[PDB]
Amino acid sequence: GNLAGIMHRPDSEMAYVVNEQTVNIRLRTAKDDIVSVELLAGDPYSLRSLPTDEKFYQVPKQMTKIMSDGISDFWQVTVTEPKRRLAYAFLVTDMLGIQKIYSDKGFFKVADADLMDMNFYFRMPFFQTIDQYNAPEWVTDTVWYQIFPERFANGDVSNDPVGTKPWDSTDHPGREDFYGGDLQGILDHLDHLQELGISGIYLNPIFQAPSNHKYDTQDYMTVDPHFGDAKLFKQLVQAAHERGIRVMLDAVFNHIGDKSVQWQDVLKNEQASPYADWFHIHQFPATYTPTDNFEFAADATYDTFDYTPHMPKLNTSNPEVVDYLLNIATYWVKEFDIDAWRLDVANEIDHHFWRKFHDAMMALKPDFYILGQIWHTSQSWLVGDEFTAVMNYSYTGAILQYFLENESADALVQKMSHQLMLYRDATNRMMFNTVDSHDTPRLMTLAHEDKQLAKSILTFTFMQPGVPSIYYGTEYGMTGENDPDDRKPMVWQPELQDHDLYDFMQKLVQVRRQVIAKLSDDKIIFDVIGERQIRLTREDNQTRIVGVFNNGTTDLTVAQPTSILLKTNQSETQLAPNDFMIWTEPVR
Amino acid sequence: GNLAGIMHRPDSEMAYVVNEQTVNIRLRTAKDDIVSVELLAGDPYSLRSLPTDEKFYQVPKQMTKIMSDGISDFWQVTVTEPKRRLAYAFLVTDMLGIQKIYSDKGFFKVADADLMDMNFYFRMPFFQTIDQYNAPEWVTDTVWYQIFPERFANGDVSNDPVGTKPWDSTDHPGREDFYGGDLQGILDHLDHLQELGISGIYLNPIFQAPSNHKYDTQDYMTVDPHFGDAKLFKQLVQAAHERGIRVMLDAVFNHIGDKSVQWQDVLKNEQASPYADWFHIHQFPATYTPTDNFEFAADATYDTFDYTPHMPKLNTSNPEVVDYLLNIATYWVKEFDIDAWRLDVANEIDHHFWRKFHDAMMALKPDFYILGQIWHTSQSWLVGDEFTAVMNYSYTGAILQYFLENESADALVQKMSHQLMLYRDATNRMMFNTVDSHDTPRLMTLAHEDKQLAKSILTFTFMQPGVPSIYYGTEYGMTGENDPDDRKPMVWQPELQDHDLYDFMQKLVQVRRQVIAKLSDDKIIFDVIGERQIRLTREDNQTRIVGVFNNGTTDLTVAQPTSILLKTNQSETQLAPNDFMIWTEPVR
Numbered sequence A, B: 001g002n003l004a005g006i007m008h009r010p011d012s013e014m015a016y017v018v019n020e021q022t023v024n025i026r027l028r029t030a031k032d033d034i035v036s037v038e039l040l041a042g043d044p045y046s047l048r049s050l051p052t053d054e055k056f057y058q059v060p061k062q063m064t065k066i067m068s069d070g071i072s073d074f075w076q077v078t079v080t081e082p083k084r085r086l087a088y089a090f091l092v093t094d095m096l097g098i099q100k101i102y103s104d105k106g107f108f109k110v111a112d113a114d115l116m117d118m119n120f121y122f123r124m125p126f127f128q129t130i131d132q133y134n135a136p137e138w139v140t141d142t143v144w145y146q147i148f149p150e151r152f153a154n155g156d157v158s159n160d161p162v163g164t165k166p167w168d169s170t171d172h173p174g175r176e177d178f179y180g181g182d183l184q185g186i187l188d189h190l191d192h193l194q195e196l197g198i199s200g201i202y203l204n205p206i207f208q209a210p211s212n213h214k215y216d217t218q219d220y221m222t223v224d225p226h227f228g229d230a231k232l233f234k235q236l237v238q239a240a241h242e243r244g245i246r247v248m249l250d251a252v253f254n255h256i257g258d259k260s261v262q263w264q265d266v267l268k269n270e271q272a273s274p275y276a277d278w279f280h281i282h283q284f285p286a287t288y289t290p291t292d293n294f295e296f297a298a299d300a301t302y303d304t305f306d307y308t309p310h311m312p313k314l315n316t317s318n319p320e321v322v323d324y325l326l327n328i329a330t331y332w333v334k335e336f337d338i339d340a341w342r343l344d345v346a347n348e349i350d351h352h353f354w355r356k357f358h359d360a361m362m363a364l365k366p367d368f369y370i371l372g373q374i375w376h377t378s379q380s381w382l383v384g385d386e387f388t389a390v391m392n393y394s395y396t397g398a399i400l401q402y403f404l405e406n407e408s409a410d411a412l413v414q415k416m417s418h419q420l421m422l423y424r425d426a427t428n429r430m431m432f433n434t435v436d437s438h439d440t441p442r443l444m445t446l447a448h449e450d451k452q453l454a455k456s457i458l459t460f461t462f463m464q465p466g467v468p469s470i471y472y473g474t475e476y477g478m479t480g481e482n483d484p485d486d487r488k489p490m491v492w493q494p495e496l497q498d499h500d501l502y503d504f505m506q507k508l509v510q511v512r513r514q515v516i517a518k519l520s521d522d523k524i525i526f527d528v529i530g531e532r533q534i535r536l537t538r539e540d541n542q543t544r545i546v547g548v549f550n551n552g553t554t555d556l557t558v559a560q561p562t563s564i565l566l567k568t569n570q571s572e573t574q575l576a577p578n579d580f581m582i583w584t585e586p587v588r
């Protein structure tokens, strides 16, 4: 066997507590190298303390191969142990029939393994629910809608910025444009969101800031006055909740704007500022050389987001900054009852801070949802003591690459399988899946205005374990290249809206909320059935939902399903290129 | 190449912060499968934000193969980055000359890799010193001596337990014997410890408890009155410090004794006890069926250490228990100035508690030493936010197995290499190495009274990266099987002491403190030079210390060293079986 390809990391996503008496254990092996894996497991102390002749290693548990990423296979088993202490090792057999035991002490022939010594084994020493990962159940039933508030609806011309342009969804916005969108506009169109079927709103930043995007915060404790005021924000959250819609705000804690009181004080007083150590200033006075790009300087004497001199990095190791940020985080939850925080640039703030943030939020609301914006693998923030989930950019990015280019279905399934095996099972169901946002090109533009392709991408994404989100205007087919062109004014003129796509999105949201979300602890299966042909299955003990996606260049015939949920061809048996068909069937 | 054998886990012992601008990065590969590894690394944002044509991936950094465990090879490189943000990927070339890039996105041909996309890469997103592992420098210079206080010296007959036996180092103690050892006895023999050269004392538990070992605590806030009182303990710590000797106490926080006020209250009041939720009680009244073994019950209705009904497990998730234990931990440090805590059964207490414990201790004493007693791999407690180190049972156990049985030198070197690559480099230098203790058989008994073999084991262990400890009486050749026979009264009668071994131990302690501890960031090298023949090298930029160990059945000839530090044969060139020779030489 390929022993270098076998690995178990104790106390990780490969060995974790599910409830007071139950753990999940995983093993990695080299792809198709290992034929079977059994777990030897039980209470460590039982071996030499109990008077019985029976020993826990005499009764193996079979592990199941659950996924492969093309390089490795992943095996899993659930174990229950009333004594809430577990010692375990793996019996691995390769394709030639060579069996070894793999433990914390390495690889052995069974005959050479010291199976009576509790210290031979890997350990889950005591099952600690205080240390475990917990998923808030309400997220399961959510479909999110992301609003960039400057561009969703102008409900009040009287708060418009100077220079506001006429509302025109066909514009190509510049970086510094204003169109006057605000909180009253969101309130005015809650009916649209309820009719679409969404159950969560994700807002980009709404606190006082000079820009149209408001990531360069001036005051975290004030709704930007071009958007509204505290009374109006409270009204919006209550109106959303009345409609069964949760609210997630954007926390921009990595950096502050340079027009904040704190940064202006540093500019006035230099190192004698009370805020000097709230930042990362290498040389005083804090300075930079301007360039023709507002958002770039080569030589700022302080750390910044990216290279922009207008977003000085906050020193979140400073206890005064920790207290300031936790008071902000607490204020919006306690006073306005929001349901979730989306954490901007979350990876660049330290774990010590995020553990304090987690503890503060869960003390206010045990079912709070904490979503980190991170584009790369995020294991260290998803143990159970920091975030609930991250933006799932790597997962939706792989889906986009498959549909928009010509890679094999095997490649896509390998990438998705790799992603799922990075994290605990419950974590995977909390990941936030969006195919576009205020920082990437729009779906309809990536698809070159091929609506069938757009529908395929959305449907495939809405079948995945994580929770889906719709970026405002996707439901009407809005186009746009990357920022700022992905921030067009929302299309409210019916003559400019794709009504067929809107009808489709209503149906797809209902499949997600009424069928997918109501399975009970389901299994997902990825089957490559042909060249660029994928069968996706989700199934519990009662119900199987199946989606077939034909993204090759030939027609595909499938058996006529008895209960079709959603399809794009008029046929009940034929899929043309880029067609799909979703159906449901009882499990036999 | 064996791609299934290649792995990098970001934000772990494979990618960690050393100081504000510097990180260490490791890669695992299959043994001898990969010929070279280069790191491509730099500021993620530089790729698209800087106006220069130069890109960080155009200038690779070579990684060095530092260790192999017989299954995998491990590669390492240190990276400095003034922007304190790092994106990185690995260029790996196998034995056939096939080169691929390995990143957070998987394996690629270089030509297919999206090297201009910061999200292609693994990430160290911002270098957070608040999250890093820190090693206290003073531990570097320490040699510990472990005292089991009931058995070290009776300095006061007036506090002896009823039934105390005459002091006789030739006895085989029973489980419930008392010999009257106490704190005044330790004070009385500090001269012996200073003459031996030790610089740290590790005490087994000293707080009020009914047993001879005192792991069944009755009151954590009181020195056991058969050992002494608070005034005497303060005197002992001050006298130890005056001699340059640090003090480590044993914290028994997993379980309490059944004669504690808290457990007795549970027995009196059942679930109406104010302490009911300080424990893990499944059924009230808390009960068990006694057996002929005091330390065993099959059916206790509450969780216990092992299966002993006299050590109910504490519920360290309960905030009242957390506060109680942190107040104990703080009291002995603040009021008596101890230097370290050794944590009994540390793995069975939750990480949430240990993070609070760490924060409390470091707030009192930034250089505090926190040592966990854990027999299995301990990665999750050694990140930098919980313990400093653990008891290094797996490492010294491998050394014992080599010297006492007949395995190959390759096997030993593989096991030690595996251990070192589990942890950060600084952590490895904080691990606590003892070849015996109050829970295992004595060295001289394991060696079947072969003093040359005992000397070999001690010398080999004292050359390792971790800090060494001597269990009381090792320096005079005390014998003993496992507990209780490893707890004989200390041998103070000169006619019964091995004076040659004592002289040897003085010399070995001086080699450790005057030579090994004073190298500056050294490299350790393990060379297998023959059948059961090992050359161990430690070297910095000025000094190399070399030890050769001949544990085969033939004579071994070595070149005459110019500066021999320690040897067992009278020859300066010949090692007989079980001889060793340590020397020092300048690096050329």
Ligand SMILES: OC[C@H]1O[C@H](O[C@H]2[C@H](O)[C@@H](O)[C@@H](O[C@H]3[C@H](O)[C@@H](O)[C@@H](O)O[C@@H]3CO)O[C@@H]2CO)[C@H](O)[C@@H](O)[C@@H]1O
Binding pocket: A213, A215, A252, A295, A305, A308, A344, A345, A346, A373, A374, A375, A438, A439, A483
């Ligand atoms: O002026 C700089 C920039 O500010 C705003 O960008 C924010 C993004 O909108 C937000 O989603 C987040 O994105 C960054 C990721 O966190 C980071 O890891 C890396 O991938 O870059 C992303 C894009 O910059 O954070 C930024 C900063 O708060 C504003 O929306 C942009 O128009 C503007 O260019």
Ligand SMILES: OC[C@H]1O[C@H](O[C@H]2[C@H](O)[C@@H](O)[C@@H](O[C@H]3[C@H](O)[C@@H](O)[C@@H](O)O[C@@H]3CO)O[C@@H]2CO)[C@H](O)[C@@H](O)[C@@H]1O
Binding pocket: B213, B215, B252, B295, B305, B308, B344, B345, B346, B373, B374, B375, B438, B439, B483
């Ligand atoms: O009455 C039970 C037992 O109590 C005392 O044993 C302690 C050991 O001395 C101490 O070092 C520690 O050892 C345990 C390890 O933590 C645990 O992981 C596993 O390896 O078992 C070890 C040995 O029991 O803890 C125990 C309990 O506090 C006492 O010294 C013994 O004589 C007595 O048998």
Ligand SMILES: [Ca+2]
Binding pocket: A154, A155, A156, A157, A158, A159, A160, A180, A181, A182, A226
């Ligand atoms: Ca407006």
Ligand SMILES: [Ca+2]
Binding pocket: B154, B155, B156, B157, B158, B159, B160, B180, B181, B182, B226
């Ligand atoms: Ca005494």
